[PDB]
From TrEMBL, chains A, B, C:
This is Major tail sheath protein. Residues 1-23 are annotated as: Disordered. It comes from Staphylococcus phage 812.
Amino acid sequence: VEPFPRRPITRPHASIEVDTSGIGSEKVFCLIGQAEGGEPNTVYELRNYSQAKRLFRSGELLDAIELAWGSNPNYTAGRILAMRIEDAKPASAEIGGLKITSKIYGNVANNIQVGLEKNTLSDSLRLRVIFQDDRFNEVYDNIGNIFTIKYKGEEANATFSVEHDEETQKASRLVLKVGDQEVKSYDLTGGAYDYTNAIITDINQLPDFEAKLSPFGDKNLESSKLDKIENANIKDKAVYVKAVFGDLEKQTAYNGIVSFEQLKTIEPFELTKLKGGTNGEPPATWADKLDKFAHEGGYYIVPLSSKQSVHAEVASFVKERSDAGEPMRAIVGGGFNESKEQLFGRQASLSNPRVSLVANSGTFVMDDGRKNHVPAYMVAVALGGLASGLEIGESITFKPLRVSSLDQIYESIDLDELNENGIISIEFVRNRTNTFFRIVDDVTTFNDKSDPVKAEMAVGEANDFLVSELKVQLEDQFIGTRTINTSASIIKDFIQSYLGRKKRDNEIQDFPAEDVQVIVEGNEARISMTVYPIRSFKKISVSLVYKQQTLQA
Amino acid sequence: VEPFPRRPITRPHASIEVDTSGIGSEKVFCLIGQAEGGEPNTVYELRNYSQAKRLFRSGELLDAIELAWGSNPNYTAGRILAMRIEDAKPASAEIGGLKITSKIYGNVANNIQVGLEKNTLSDSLRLRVIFQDDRFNEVYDNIGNIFTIKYKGEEANATFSVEHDEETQKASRLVLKVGDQEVKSYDLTGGAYDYTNAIITDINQLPDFEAKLSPFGDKNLESSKLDKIENANIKDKAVYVKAVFGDLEKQTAYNGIVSFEQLKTIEPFELTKLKGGTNGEPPATWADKLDKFAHEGGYYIVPLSSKQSVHAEVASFVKERSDAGEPMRAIVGGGFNESKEQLFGRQASLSNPRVSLVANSGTFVMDDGRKNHVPAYMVAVALGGLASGLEIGESITFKPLRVSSLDQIYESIDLDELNENGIISIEFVRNRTNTFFRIVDDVTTFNDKSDPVKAEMAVGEANDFLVSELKVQLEDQFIGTRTINTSASIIKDFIQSYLGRKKRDNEIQDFPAEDVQVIVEGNEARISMTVYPIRSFKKISVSLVYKQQTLQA
Amino acid sequence: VEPFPRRPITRPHASIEVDTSGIGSEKVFCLIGQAEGGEPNTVYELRNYSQAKRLFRSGELLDAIELAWGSNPNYTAGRILAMRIEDAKPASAEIGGLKITSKIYGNVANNIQVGLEKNTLSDSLRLRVIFQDDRFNEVYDNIGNIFTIKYKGEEANATFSVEHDEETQKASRLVLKVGDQEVKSYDLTGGAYDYTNAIITDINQLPDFEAKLSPFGDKNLESSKLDKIENANIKDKAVYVKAVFGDLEKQTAYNGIVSFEQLKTIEPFELTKLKGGTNGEPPATWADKLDKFAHEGGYYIVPLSSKQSVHAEVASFVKERSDAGEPMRAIVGGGFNESKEQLFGRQASLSNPRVSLVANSGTFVMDDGRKNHVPAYMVAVALGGLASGLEIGESITFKPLRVSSLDQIYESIDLDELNENGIISIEFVRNRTNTFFRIVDDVTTFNDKSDPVKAEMAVGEANDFLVSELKVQLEDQFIGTRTINTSASIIKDFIQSYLGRKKRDNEIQDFPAEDVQVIVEGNEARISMTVYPIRSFKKISVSLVYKQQTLQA
């Protein structure tokens, strides 16, 4: 409730109270792999292809992301999470009295070039930043010289100064003197002259003084970062307050690839390349990387590695999150063109209801036109992007893959053995005029049909999502509320509404209203409910018996 | 029961108890005999004819598999288990720096050929393998030369080595050196360095070295199996790492019918045939050979032999397995055209409730075009294939045989005597214009008809299957469950549901659901029930009576 | 009852009396072993796998905990208690005037490196610690110097002292002294000057002196730990109050692995390793560790060793604690692959009601791809983890084990012999088409089959929990209270309630509530009752009878 006004008054009045309640899931997809750009140990949301390309300059993780968005043409291209295994570091250098550091992490940063010069035509400094890989090139001409200070009187002496705060050496004052003593001083630490344009305007307003800002770029530097000046004549020329480095910072703080910082005196330097760009080497165990995925929000995750250790590490990780309260699933591929024995060895090793194995590897027509021949786990990414595209409780069974070709095209007996042993496989559908490829089943690596929740990805996904959403909503809604007499009826009404929404969205088959019962006792509330699971059709039995018919006239 | 979350929580939260309880026999056939192919003392699963023909090359067993799957036109092809009695051994030879052995067991394996003639243009060994029987003549090349490394630094000379563990010849290091000082090294133990990909990436990072995978086989061999280099110069050459042993493991694990072993350095050798292929000798007893089918799920088994000792052994084998909880039945045939007195002599020798004898022998039309004149036990194989094609508690009485002809055409009296003595016989139907052959009865060799359970094969089958399924289900479900007051009621409900489901399938005729009396006391559960067994008509009586009817107008 | 107010009032008033009565068990598995971390003789409670890894760094005990929590996929991960037999001690260095000490117990602590430096800008020390085994490296820069004092007055001198008191050997006063008099005193021995912030606030009271906090800020040290200073000039100096001791304790008390304490004078010294890190001797007798246990509530305990003396000592310990009101039980196992005759020996040597012997040994697949082939007592850990997963009065009979493979595959006769000698055995089933491992029976070493409480783990567990709860509740509520004349009915109501609650959770079968009797005489609480015990099925008798049914049309 929102009272109006928020401050009660005791005198006679009228009070209005407003309640805005009643006016008003994504299934996010995750990837870990190799990339030629981006920070290490950092997760990034990705929906726009331009952002993904800029972040990940190139590698196998950008190709995996492009396949996932392109593996489901008839679905929405949704949110992806991505991380770079490589412990890259950026290129840096110290030259000219300035610390230089690049925003690009890896060997690519070494191509950055930066240089500083001076312009004799205006008594101002000059800068150039170049990154040839992006064809980036910019010249920040006439850095510094923020504004002039002029004097117009006839007195013999006219001088100005800029003083510093001793404890920090920051510009605190700007004093104007004419003759032997001050005319006016512009305090910079506090007052009306926090910005230098206010100083320019007031100097202009003075009788025998003039001032103007240099037009090259809207500098508007705050007066804290001004250079020190001591008894510099005004009557000679309209003298500039240079402040070259502060203007440089204000111009290039959020522009370009390079950042600058003080080393001490700053002086120009030749256009020279950076140094220190290094990618590093990958770690032995990827489990330390998965900690950053613990509370990011997602369901399907596919590492780009065919090694069994990475698979075991992610299997453990998603089991730990499942036992914590944020369940996830892993889809993994068996290398390049592995035989049935290797797939069996993998499935026997993995043997987990939250883990699914992909056998077939093949080629995909990339957007660049390359016939990208890739390993199984890139197909597992594509299945993960199809399974993020599907609504809850749907299955990837018999869904088109839009693959170009496959390395291994199986027999009926081979497909049956792959299905029976908990490996997802693909068949080349040849009987049609329009030949294509379809997924045969979404069976998990754990290989028992007693529990379809464990045996089937869709059922388990519907189970996980239902339990998590019910847990979250019940905890948000009714924990902390009052145990009023109508608490049980309200709870029952809220569960019915929730189950009716689930049934409306086809996330459940049906539920019996009578089984929903609410028991209140002390600080607790025990609830009994029934739901009929949603299920996918995987067997159709038909019986066709002919009969005779006799016709009269 | 499946509480969620699995970790206990003490702070305020919500708890969910997910429960999937409740929502969740093929009568396999077996054959034993001889073939020209497949390993000895190894049982296999047969689903497709092409699979069996590839494994089981030829002989009487392949014909028996073809007759079993073809003896039942109107029924499906049921799964069959097969094994080879011969004590065959494979071909093996010592050549080059390796020991070679074949996987197929038998005299045919001697024609296998292995050679490593070197194609010096590609600097790799051209592995040609030949098996003239299978029309397998394929050429393999690009063994060795896994990838290249080249040096382009400014020093005077450079050299590199791969250091192994001398006691095992396991690669542990890859060291790049200038003179005797290491530029950089990559320990090949415990990490990403276990594979050639890390070596490639890390060497590519250095500007002074190149490392690129060659198109001569994308092996990506492990780093432990690399060859031993000892200070080979790198300045002038793009030195090729080879790893011939690991390249044989990668490229020829599952290619051909050839294995390899080390006693040495691999060198070229001529294309040489293998020796030592042996069919072997039969065993003194088939009881050890039958023990491989003990726990394979088989119910019907037919030996491809007409010897009385093999029949008595099989009879003792099925008795022992039945008594051990693995019920079975056996069908046998006495050679070619034996007289009635031999069949009586066999039957009186056998006299076993689980064994049935086939009298008739004839000709069959095979897919090879041979009008194969087969003995009685092949007709027993055909009959077992028909029985497997039938469901539980069905009889093969008056079913068609689909035979071309029969050596013996028995008259009414001869058939009656064969049935009375307890031998299965086959008659030729001349009553109609569309003549055909059919089975007259399925009586067992235990001749006492007073007890139909033992005499009738269908009744015995239905009893065996019912008992074993009820025993397995009760053992799985109820043992270890609490002795609560509702246990008896749950047990009686489960029994009623099992008997009602069996009645639905028509495996049993009827049962009184009111007489299912469960008693519970401590660890023991005493259960009593009644079941009317499904039977098969074999005699029809019609008391036709003629009467006179008077008509009026 | 607790009246409001508790003290009587005699004037006319209103008196309120309020009664708050009426409005308002766990099972734990223990473990003893060796590891690379943890204190000796200390009972550590574990809830999270991460907690166990951080405390117990590595070794067999962490693997045991992982196996225990991995042996119940369906059930919740209950609290587990752990202890280290090894009498480890931590690493320490008597370098300089500081006794550097490490928290971790064992030889790994010796790798710790500690050294000091100093920054002359702020006149403050530096401290560093390097424990890169845990990826730990921190630098405590600019230690001390909490705040500054500067002089702004008109006197001719300006000094401050921090007096050191010989009686307390601590900083007692901080006084601003000029000439031969005290400007203003701040007595640290008492008052609000026990903290520094009082001193900072009060210094600002003087016109002649002002104070400000250090730019580093948050130290907030006790005035009594300040350093000894005598009249340091502050006339034109912003002298920092060093306070080295307080900021040394703050930056190192809970930071990292390394503690610090003076033996001597504080001085900087270079980087040096720690010494004295000792894993410690493994004591022959485990009673030195078993006696350290307490009333935590643990029931099950597995010793991680195959020694007879360890098993005997555990048996004697659990019997003693049971007799002392703390019921406990144990599960043991012998090495690898012991023959039956050895296992008969071990059972005869124990013959304990509260000890169970495991026959089988095998292999388990762990998180980091570890195919750890383990001794039999690890299997016993897995069994104890299952049992803790199971609720009160359940058994481990016919439950799955989730083991990868087994050493001894016992046949039915072997399992029968093992069960007859009271030895728990694990079996690999070939009866089902999908094979799996599972437990046979929960039989104890004690071999008097007429006593199911002792013979069967589940019955003995239920009886102990029932007796222990009953006696605790009755002692808490009624027994030992003041005598009154109307306690029998209330005691019988409480008893009935308790029996109802036990029956509700299926801890008991039933109870004749009419037969509950309560008699009180003086202080003798005489109770007598009857209870039908809980039991779990182990034998099923099915008397099937076949009959013939006649049908009319």
